[PDB]
Structures are given as structure tokens and as C-alpha cells.
Ligand binder design. Structure first.
Ligand SMILES: *[C@@H]1O[C@H](CO)[C@@H](O)[C@H](O)[C@H]1NC(C)=O
Ligand SMILES: *[C@@H]1O[C@H](CO)[C@@H](O)[C@H](O)[C@H]1NC(C)=O
Ligand SMILES: OCCN1C[C@H](O)[C@@H](O)[C@H](O)[C@@H](O)C1
Lengths: 497, 497
């Protein structure tokens, strides 16, 4: 039921206007019958994940672009896709009337929407907060006696997450990251700027900080929320730079290694939270593989690290083979996970461009590239923001897939949302990326995966302005003849048996 | 001859204050006997290329790091060091009273200063202009009859360049680069944003554009100025991004190749300017090696390309090994030159930081890294800016080694100026990079060169906060005992015979 209500704001494409009584949604999912395929299409001209189906052909009579599926070339398994429940996202969602709130959550979490199964949760404040605070703001409180959650957790974030879980049919995984420690644990005594933990790994500052993870997890467990994973620190490299404008805590790779080895790993291992995974890095991929070499060749640290979390500034450009590829080569049993991505912030261009096709294309290009270099999940940044791209106490505004307009009790679904949906909606946890080869150089971006039930899903992004005719071959079934219109993204699904 | 007059503005180091009647300057160089070395020292604590001399002993007193000269390992030969005579630089210089103008010119170009020997010169307007213009703004003038130089050239740039050549130690080379063509040759009809030359290589538009290069060289030659080299286009990748705010002209690597092959090479070869070198790319190193593969494997393109020009801004998305290192491996006889050696310039920071040591250390680290990855030359960007980092008709962002304060008839020499000088002053054209072997893992950056007269120069940059004890060995001479203070840069000079 219910198509997108489009509105142009002068940019390349439209947004979809949602309010208290109306929001675009999908019908509950059917699967195509064996011998047919399903196609979801989004265009810069305005199609929004439209469902169509076609026949799978037995024969293909040469000789244009062919993408061959390689079912037996088996790669990484997928953890999931989601975004971040920041103070700012929660604050915006809740500023809406209760019914508009539900249509917004259903868009991300339910099967009537794009079926996210990951939520990233800051541990205390970040730049997407309207005040700086930690859970332990009493100075020198080493025992953590005045550890508590503020209203941001108890009245905003946690009630929202619960509502997300009730809406979702997929199991949802929670991921936690700290931006800063209490200031009394830090060399510079401030939430921002250059500074790291006082003293050295093994000592009372480091033990206290490690205990602060356990106290956080207990506080959330009391509200009936259990975490899948935590990261060692959000963007540890940030806290090494003088003048770093917002919450941060500096770790060189050697500091992070020793911190995990001496403190964070054992503290977590000897707690009721021993099943929580620990991810290292949580920072720009350009720090790989070096960061991974320092930490993971230390067996005392490696025994506790489940994975490597990476960030990207979406405005800026790769190679990825030299980072993600090499990291995987070196540590094939250590999963890579994209924990944050956002589109800026060009300068030049506004923080929020309502309707930007380019920004959407930047998301799917990124997800595809990540998928092709072994990455197992992709977590977007703020779930929702206002039209200024905030609130953000440091004015570090960015874009988000859903923009809330509180004065009108409406929200807008950006192209980013749909570009994300082409992946989150159809690649459940346990899907496995398989091989896909091109018959000739082309302008498309594609990735192929196997759904845990054996069915296929292939995403095809066309960043050129020209329609590109293509066929996909899957030896088990035959041929999918199709066209990828210029400036479009399609997801193709079909049974193999 | 005259020491630095220090002033703080509340950052890590000081600047040197210069005015109509005082500038810090050097005495002519000296040729100390065999066994004696010269040290020039700058420190964050305030010392500014301070001269001292010491012994090279037969005995080794030190027990820490050893750097050993290996004069027989020979590497690239140096073209030289310089900066950009943009509109903004010219306006800033010329707003000083004439005695202050010469002190500032002498600072860069003279033996009393740091001996630049390259100047980069934009072909018409760029963002560091106070208005948009090209040399051929009257439409559909394919024969470029109305081609002429505005007062920006004839009144500002050219007289300053003449003055610099009069003042200079060394022969100075000029390097030219265009930002945009006349807009009536462009797909988009605009000085900026996403747009190329109309049509395809070989046609009338590409032919007129190529003739524009020759008209420029002719025009400058009437003023009695010959160029060493031109680039194909300043930052061609920029004109591929929609909304790009500064003057630009987009070329894909393929387009650059065919343009050079069909038009820009043959046109310059058939002219009295056939000796002018052509550099390709002139962009961020992250487009390497790809761009070099695209252009230099076409032998119709390759025969015209003398070398590859690179910019530093986005180096942090790199790194050098994968871009510069690899490009040298694939094309060992094509020189790498840094055509815009600046800065970046973190998002929370003010445009100009008077007395920022950190930006200084970024320059020298970056020259060192360039040197260890085969780079033969450097052009810094604006020779001078105002304290707002302008004038720029679009936006301020970058610092400059000299900041002019016209209301006070004074200019400030930033730590950048001295970091640049530690190289440009002591490393003349024809110098050759040579082996320098570190005996053990250490925190310093170092490079060694051989002066064309056979003497050694070694630059040692210490970016850590700790003093590092150090010995330098010349197999032909002995051991030089020294200390590299934290946050310091030294250059050592000694005769080898
Ligand atoms: C909700 O949006 C639909 C447009 O889809 C419209 O018919 C209705 O008026 C809107 N409600 C409000 C309160 O604006
Ligand atoms: C120029 O600088 C010198 C040295 O600091 C100083 O003696 C002189 O007063 C300055 N001139 C003016 C006009 O301030
Ligand atoms: O991957 C992009 C880098 N992040 C930018 C984001 O805007 C910030 O709010 C966030 O707090 C940081 O983790 C850094």
C-alpha cells in the first residue's frame, strides 16, 4: 500500500513527505515464483523502490553486458544494516506527534519499511547532543558511585529503541561506542581537544574506564536491552589532534592494543557481559592495515577483539583494496564492519540537500564497495535530523536519510533512505556475498549475495546518465534480461530452486 | 646579518615581524673547511634558521641514533622550490610600501633569503583573484583575435616576477597553469561548476583552447618572460564535480590523454615554445597511479608529457607509497613534481594561524616524504596572503608562509616560511637525493642530498616533544654529534673534501 508523496526542494530529485496520517510503505513481502524475478527500482526521475517482476529466460543470444553469478565463490556473511540512535535523532523523532513517530520508526524497522537490524548507540554525549555529559561526571569518582544514565537515555534513546524492537521482525542488534570518558580520567581534563586516558594501561584510570563499559551495559540491561557489540572508542585518532572540537578520547594504536589487552578485554571477559563482541578501531579506514597490525599481532590483545570497525567521510574518495582488502588478507577471521558513514558538509554545499540524488548514490556506492571488500555490515549515522542538519552543540551539521520538520509535524525520506533500503530490505543477517563477474568493462556497480534460504539478491547501481542494457546469468536458473536506466539503483531477487 | 623579531598571536610558536625598514636576513654563505659542519636550526621555542658550526670527528661519542650518508646510492635530481604569484599574492605584496616590497621579495628569492627558484603563474583568474576573467572573454573568437592580458598580469604579476628575477641568486623557472577556459568553450557556459570543453579532442573547441596556451606564452614573451613548463589543467578532476565553486575545466583522465595527444602536444610542438615542458595531472596524488596509466600508456600522449604534477591538499586520503611510489615504479622516467604544495587546514581551524608550528611541521614532513618518494620539485601556493587568508572571491581556507598586514605596513613570516627555507635555501637545482640509512627505529624524519658542488646537505625534522640524541656519519669525513631538540627542524651542511 501507499506510494511516495513527492516534493521537490530544487535539487536533483524529490523527497517523500510523511506525516501523522500518511507515509509510503511496502506491502508485506511475497517472493517471486521459481522462474521469475522481482525487481525493486529507484530513479532520479522519482521512482521509489517500485516492485515489478519479469521472466527468467532459458537462453541468451549474445552479446551485450553479461554479469555472471558465481554461486560457489563464497565470501563474507552479513551482520546487518542500520543507523545511529543519537541524542539528536531521538530528540527529533520524539518532537513529532506520536502517530508520525510510529510511521517514522516503521519506515526503518518494520517489514512495511526497510527492515534495519542494527542500532548504534552512543555511550553518553557526542556532537549530536545538545549538552556534553558522561555517566560519571563527579570528579575523581574511581569507584563509579555516581554512575547513572541521564534522561537522554531513559526518556529518549531507550524508549525509542524498545519501540524499534517491537516493530521489527528481524532480530535487532545493538552496538555501543563511547566518544569520551569522564573528564577526570583524561590528561587534558576536558571532553574535547587533545587528550587521552591518564597514566598507562593496567592502572586505575584504565581499570575505571574499563569498569565504565561494564556499568553502562548493566544500566542498559536493567532497562531490558542487551548489546551485541561495543567499540573500543569512537574515532580514537581524533583525540590526538589539538583543538579537536568535540567529544573525543585519544589512543595511538599501541595505546588501544594495551588497553584491550590489560583492561577492556579482561574486564569484559570476567563480567556477565562476556558475550558482547569487542570491535577495535571505530575510525577512518585510511588507518588500515597498520592499526590492525599493531593490535592483532599482539595475541594478548587479539584474543578479545572480534572485529574491526571502520568509518568513512562520504564526501571523500578511496582506494579500498589497500586498506580493507589488505586488512582481510592479513586477518581473514577478523570481520570488517562499517560502523559510521555520513555525507557532509562540502561547503560549497549545504549540510542537508533535500532531495539529493548524488548523496543517495554516494551511500549505495559505498555499501557496494564495502561489500565487495569483505565488509559484513554498514551502519549509517544519525537516524533523523532537523532541516539544519542538527541539533549539534558544536554546529557540526550533516545530512541524514530522514529529515524531521517539527513545525509542520512532517518528515522527509531522502534518496539516501531508499538507497540504503535497496540493501537493508533484502539482505538479511546470514546472507553471504558470492562472486559476480562482468563480461566487459562497464559503468555499473554491482554486488551479488545469497539469502540464507538459498535465494539470490543482486544490487545494481548506475551512476552514469545512460541506460545500460544488461543480462545476469545464474547457471542454476538462466538469464535475467534487463536495463539499468541512468541514475538508478535496482535490487533483483529470484529463487534458485 | 639580522635576527628574527618575534611576535606571538596565541598559537604554539611565534612569527617574524618584518616592515619597511627591518627584515630578518642571512649573510652570504661560507665554505667551512673539511671537518667542520654547519647547522641551521629552527625551533618551536622561537629560534629561526640560526647558524652554528661544529666538528666532524674521527671518533663516535654518541650511543643513540645513527644516520649514515650513503652518497653512492643516487636518486632523483632536484628542479627546485617556489610559490605561486597569484592575483591575491601580487595584491598583498603591492599593498606594502616599496621598501617593504623588496624586503619581502628578498625574503623569498634572494641569497639574503631562502632562494626560491620556481614561480607558478595562473593563466588568468582562479579563486585567489578578486574577479573572474580569462584572456579571451569575447564569445566565439575561435582565432583568439581579442586575446589579451588584463592589468592583473601587466600591472601586478609580470612586474613582480621581473623584480623577483632581478633579486634572485639562481635562475628562476616559471611554471604556468590554467583554471578555466573562456566560458564559450565549455559545456556548461560558466567559469565554474561541472563542465568540460565542448565536443571532442581534435575539434575546433580543443584546437582554440590549445592555441590559447600559445597566445599566453607569446603574450608573456612580449614581456620578456619564458616558461619552463605548463600543466595541462589545474585540478581537472574538480570540473567533474557538480557545483564546484572555483574556476575549473573538467577532464577525465581519458579526456586529458586525447586532448594532449591530438591538440595540446602538437600545438606546442609546432610553436616557438616547443621547449616548454608539459606536466599532466596537476591534482591530488590520490588519482595516481590510475591517471598516469591512462595517459602515459598512449604513446601519442606520452611523447608530449615531460612529467606528472601533484597537489598535497588531500594527501591524507593517500598514502605516498601507493601513489607516488607506485607511479615511479610504473613510469621511472617521468618526473614527479608537486605543483601546489599546501596545506589542509582542518575543519575547525581558522584560515590563518599566525605562528603555528604545527602547519610548519606539516610542510617539512610533506617535502621530506615527497623527497623519499622521487619528487623533484615544489611549488607552494600563494606567496602571500592577508590575515583573513585572502583575498579570494569564493572562500578563505588556506594559510600562507607570509601574511601581509597593509594597515600596519608589515608582513609576518610564518613557521611555514622557515620550514620551507630549510630546504629551498640549501637545495639548489641540480642537487641529487642520496642514501641516508637510519641505524635503528627512531621518531625523526630525515633526508640527505648532494649539492651540485659535491657537498652534503641533511635535513632532520623532529616532530615529537622529546630531544633526540643523534650522530650523523659521512664515510668520507667522520661523525657529527648533535641533538635534535623536540619540535625542531635542522639542516646540516658540510664539505666532503
Ligand atoms: C498528510 O499528507 C497527505 C498528503 O499525502 C494529505 O492529503 C494530508 O492533508 C496531510 N496531513 C496534514 C495534517 O497535513
Ligand atoms: C620596524 O621594525 C623594527 C624592528 O622591530 C622597529 O625598530 C621599527 O620601529 C619598526 N617600524 C615601525 C614603523 O614600527
Ligand atoms: O565518519 C565520519 C566522521 N564522523 C563525523 C560525524 O559527523 C560526527 O558527528 C561523529 O561524531 C564522528 O564520529 C566523526
Amino acid at each position: 500500500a501507499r506510494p511516495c508523496i513527492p516534493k521537490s526542494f530544487g535539487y536533483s530529485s524529490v523527497v517523500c513527505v510523511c506525516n501523522a496520517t500518511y507515509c509510503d510503505s511496502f506491502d508485506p513481502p511475497t517472493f517471486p515464483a521459481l522462474g521469475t524475478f522481482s525487481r525493486y527500482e529507484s530513479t532520479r526521475s522519482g521512482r521509489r523502490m517500485e516492485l515489478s517482476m519479469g521472466p527468467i529466460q532459458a537462453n541468451h543470444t549474445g552479446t551485450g553486458l553479461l554479469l555472471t553469478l558465481q554461486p560457489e565463490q563464497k565470501f563474507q556473511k552479513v551482520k546487518g544494516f542500520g543507523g545511529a540512535m543519537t541524542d539528536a535523532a531521538a530528540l527529533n523523532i520524539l518532537a513529532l506527534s506520536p502517530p508520525a513517530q510510529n510511521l517514522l520508526l516503521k519506515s526503518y524497522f518494520s517489514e512495511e519499511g526497510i527492515g534495519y537490524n542494527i542500532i548504534r548507540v552512543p555511550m553518553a554525549s557526542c556532537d549530536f547532543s545538545i549538552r556534553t555529559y558522561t555517566y560519571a561526571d563527579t570528579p575523581d569518582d574511581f569507584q563509579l558511585h555516581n554512575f547513572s544514565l541521564p534522561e537522554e537515555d531513559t526518556k529518549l534513546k531507550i524508549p525509542l529503541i524498545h519501540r524499534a524492537l517491537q516493530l521489527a521482525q528481524r532480530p535487532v542488534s545493538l552496538l555501543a561506542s563511547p566518544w569520551t570518558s569522564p573528564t577526570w580520567l583524561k590528561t587534558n581534563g576536558a571532553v574535547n581537544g587533545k587528550g587521552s586516558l591518564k597514566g598507562q594501561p593496567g592502572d586505575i584510570y584504565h581499570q575505571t574506564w574499563a569498569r565504565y563499559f561494564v556499568k553502562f551495559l548493566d544500566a542498559y540491561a536493567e532497562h531490558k536491552l542487551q548489546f551485541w557489540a561495543v567499540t573500543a572508542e569512537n574515532e580514537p585518532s581524533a583525540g590526538l589532534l589539538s583543538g579537536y572540537p568535540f567529544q573525543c578520547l585519544g589512543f595511538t594504536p599501541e595505546h588501544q592494543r594495551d588497553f584491550i589487552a590489560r583492561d577492556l578485554g579482561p574486564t569484559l571477559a570476567n563480567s556477565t557481559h562476556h558475550n558482547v563482541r569487542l570491535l577495535m578501531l571505530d575510525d577512518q579506514r585510511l588507518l588500515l592495515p597498520h592499526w590492525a597490525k599493531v593490535v592483532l599481532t599482539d595475541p594478548e590483545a587479539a584474543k578479545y577483539v572480534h572485529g574491526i570497525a571502520v568509518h568513512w567521510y562520504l564526501d571523500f574518495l578511496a582506494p579500498a583494496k589497500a586498506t580493507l582488502g589488505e586488512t582481510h588478507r592479513l586477518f581473514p577471521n577478523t570481520m570488517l564492519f562499517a560502523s559510521e558513514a555520513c555525507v557532509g558538509s562540502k561547503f560549497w554545499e549545504q549540510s542537508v540537500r533535500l532531495g539529493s540524488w548524488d548523496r543517495g548514490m554516494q551511500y549505495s556506492h559505498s555499501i557496494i564497495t564495502n561489500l565487495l571488500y569483505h565488509v559484513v555490515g554498514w551502519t549509517d549515522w544519525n537516524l533523523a535530523l532537523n532541516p539544519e542538519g542538527g541539533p549539534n552543540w558544536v554546529r557540526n551539521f550533516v545530512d541524514s536519510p530522514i529529515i524531521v520538520d517539527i513545525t509542520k509535524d512532517t518528515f522527509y525520506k531522502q534518496p539516501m533512505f531508499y538507497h540504503l533500503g535497496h540493501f537493508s530490505k533484502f539482505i538479511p543477517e546470514g546472507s553471504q556475498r558470492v562472486g559476480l563477474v562482468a563480461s566487459q568493462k562497464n559503468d555499473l556497480d554491482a554486488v551479488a549475495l545469497m539469502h540464507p534460504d538459498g535465494s539470490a539478491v543482486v544490487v545494481v547501481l548506475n551512476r552514469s546518465s545512460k541506460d545500460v542494457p544488461l543480462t545476469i546469468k545464474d547457471p542454476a536458473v538462466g538469464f535475467l534480461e534487463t536495463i539499468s536506466p541512468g541514475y538508478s539503483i535496482h535490487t533483483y531477487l529470484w529463487h534458485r530452486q
